[PDB]
Amino acid sequence: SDLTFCEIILMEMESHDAAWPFLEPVNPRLVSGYRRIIKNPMDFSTMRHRLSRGGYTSSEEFAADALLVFDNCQTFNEDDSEVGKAGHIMRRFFESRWEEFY
Numbered sequence: 001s002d003l004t005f006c007e008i009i010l011m012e013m014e015s016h017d018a019a020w021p022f023l024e025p026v027n028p029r030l031v032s033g034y035r036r037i038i039k040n041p042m043d044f045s046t047m048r049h050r051l052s053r054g055g056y057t058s059s060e061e062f063a064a065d066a067l068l069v070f071d072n073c074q075t076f077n078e079d080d081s082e083v084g085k086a087g088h089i090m091r092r093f094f095e096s097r098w099e100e101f102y
């Protein structure tokens with residue numbers, strides 16, 4: 001039951017218009033400084049893989065990874081940058097969709 005909702009949230013985040021920065025892991029060879037700054041990278045396809053394996057024991061673990069995506073986003077990108085702007089839309093989407101399930 002706790003896993004069923006995450007399947008919905010993740011499917012909705014995957015297809016959201018503002019999801020394009022977060023569908024695959026950041027390629028640190030292409031982003032000067034990323035590895036130095038972001039110690040725990042996270043993205044939607046990693047969460048999708050972990051969910052497929054069943055590696056989420058609880059609903060809160062899924063939420064921790066989701067928040068980590070947007071913490072990393074706000075750590076590295078300016079709020080007015082094109083990736084920052086998308087991260088805020090996705091972050092607000094996740095929080096508001098999380099709260100109508102829990």
Ligand SMILES: CCc1c(-c2csc(N3CCN(CC4CCN(CC)CC4)CC3)n2)[nH]c(C)c1C(C)=O
Nearest residue numbers: 020021022023024025026031034072073076077083
């Ligand atoms: C600033 C760099 C950064 C990004 C970023 C910048 S551009 C981009 N991608 C990701 C993948 N995407 C795949 C294509 C190919 C397939 N499709 C074609 C139909 C369209 C999309 C291409 C654009 N990701 N994301 C994050 C979290 C960042 C940081 C530093 O936090």
